[PDB]
Design a protein around this nucleic acid. Structure first.
Length: 47
DNA sequence: ATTAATTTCTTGACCTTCCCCTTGCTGGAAGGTTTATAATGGGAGCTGTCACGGATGC
């Protein structure tokens, strides 16, 4: 509905919601869970 | 129609740079990697540009 790519980039930014401190450490814990799932699943690999 | 003293040709025998390299650093240039308090909706015309068609919405 516009012609500037940075304004619809700001629209796509405003589609998603920001984080508080507890949200920041929750997304950090989700990153930790996504890392540790591969870290424990690679322990079952013979290579 | 002949050849003997000059005058060129040819061949070793010498003469330079170009470039890579000598041990031992010394400096310069190109490319990639962290740094761990708090950092969360950014920014910039310029119109005082006017009169056409080509596509959009009643």
């Amino acid at each position: 509905r516009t012609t500037d790519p940075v304004r619809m980039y700001m629209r796509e930014m405003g589609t998603v919601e920001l984080l508080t401190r507890e949200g920041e450490i929750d997304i950090a814990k989700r990153i930790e869970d996504g890392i540790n799932q591969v870290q424990c699943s690679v322990a079952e690999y013979p290579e």
